[PDB]
Amino acid sequence: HTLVWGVWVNGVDQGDGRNIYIRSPPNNNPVKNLTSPDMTCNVDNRVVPKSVPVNAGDTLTFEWYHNTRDDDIIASSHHGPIAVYIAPAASNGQGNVWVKLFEDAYNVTNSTWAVDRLITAHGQHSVVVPHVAPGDYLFRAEIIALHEADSLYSQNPIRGAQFYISCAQITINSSDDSTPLPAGVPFPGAYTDSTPGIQFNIYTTPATSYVAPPPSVWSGALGGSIAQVGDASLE
Numbered sequence: 231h232t233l234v235w236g237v238w239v240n241g242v243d244q245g246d247g248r249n250i251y252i253r254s255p256p257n258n259n260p261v262k263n264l265t266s267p268d269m270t271c272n273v274d275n276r277v278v279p280k281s282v283p284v285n286a287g288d289t290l291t292f293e294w295y296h297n298t299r300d301d302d303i304i305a306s307s308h309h310g311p312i313a314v315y316i317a318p319a320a321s322n323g324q325g326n327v328w329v330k331l332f333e334d335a336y337n338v339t340n341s342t343w344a345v346d347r348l349i350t351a352h353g354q355h356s357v358v359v360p361h362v363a364p365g366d367y368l369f370r371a372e373i374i375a376l377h378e379a380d381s382l383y384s385q386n387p388i389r390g391a392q393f394y395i396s397c398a399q400i401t402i403n404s405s406d407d408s409t410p411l412p413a414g415v416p417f418p419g420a421y422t423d424s425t426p427g428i429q430f431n432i433y434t435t436p437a438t439s440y441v442a443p444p445p446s447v448w449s450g451a452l453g454g455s456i457a458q459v460g461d462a463s464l465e
């Protein structure tokens with residue numbers, strides 16, 4: 231159970247975005263139904279009044295939290311991967327529009343899942359804004375918590391993989407459109423019961439064995455990381 235508080239751009243806090251430039255749901259409950267429209271941008275998908283201005287090559291940092299800003303972020307039990315996708319705003323997230331910019335699952339060196347390092351990063355993880363067409367976009371940040379992913383929600387609705395999905399409204403201003411956005415995947419639709427990484431037992435399978443759900447990261451993606459860029463406690 232975790233939500234996005236806001237974003238930073240090039241290490242500068244853009245301020246509380248909840249229901250402002252983040253299409254925030256009313257609480258931190260997970261989405262579990264892979265076929266539901268809630269898979270797109272969570273349970274309250276509507277246009278919010280602001281869109282964060284960025285340029286290609288900028289660092290866009292999502293900041294997550296549990297109950298209050300810069301708290302425990304997400305429960306430590308929620309081991310799992312993190313992804314970020316992009317789609318044009320005009321889609322409203324519908325169709326085959328979502329392009330993957332970032333994926334982190336398990337890091338063998340450090341023996342840590344993406345979620346583990348998200349906590350250590352005070353909720354912060356980033357992508358570099360790609361050289362796509364200037365305009366309005368949705369950035370869909372997705373945490374998958376696997377602590378009940380031994381089961382399938384479709385089979386047992388009290389268990390299953392848990393999705394913490396947040397959509398940020400981002401306006402790309404300066405960009406040469408040298409890497410125009412390719413075809414994407416639909417949400418709901420891309421993840422099914424047979425998809426690698428949706429049904430997995432973290433308690434008996436080695437994490438080195440884990441395969442995150444496709445699609446793969448777009449070759450035009452410019453970078454990303456799970457790491458603190460800024461100190462909220464000084465805000």
Ligand SMILES: OC[C@H]1O[C@@H](O[C@H]2[C@H](O)[C@@H](O)[C@H](O[C@H]3[C@H](O)[C@@H](O)[C@H](O)O[C@@H]3CO)O[C@@H]2CO)[C@H](O)[C@@H](O)[C@@H]1O
Nearest residue numbers: 231232257258259296297298304305306307308377378
């Ligand atoms: O169900 C057993 C599993 O519980 C996990 O903890 C979650 C609780 O089940 C869940 O009810 C609680 O929801 C809280 C939420 O954290 C809080 O922010 C909000 O204000 O109130 C909700 C209650 O309405 O969330 C926790 C995770 O934070 C354990 O993590 C898991 O190991 C255990 O198996």
Ligand SMILES: *[C@@H]1O[C@H](CO)[C@@H](O)[C@H](O)[C@H]1NC(C)=O
Nearest residue numbers: 263264265266267268384387
């Ligand atoms: C999952 O979502 C589908 C598509 O909206 C819906 O028809 C179905 O009833 C949902 N499942 C549950 C258990 O609510």
Ligand SMILES: [Cl-]
Nearest residue numbers: 231260378392
């Ligand atoms: Cl839970």
Ligand SMILES: [Cl-]
Nearest residue numbers: 260261262263
């Ligand atoms: Cl659900």
Ligand SMILES: [Cl-]
Nearest residue numbers: 350351457458
């Ligand atoms: Cl860090």
Ligand SMILES: [Cl-]
Nearest residue numbers: 286361405406
């Ligand atoms: Cl550019």
Ligand SMILES: [Cl-]
Nearest residue numbers: 264265418419
């Ligand atoms: Cl579907």
Ligand SMILES: [Cl-]
Nearest residue numbers: 356453454455
């Ligand atoms: Cl980065």
Ligand SMILES: [Cu+2]
Nearest residue numbers: 231232305308
């Ligand atoms: Cu939770």
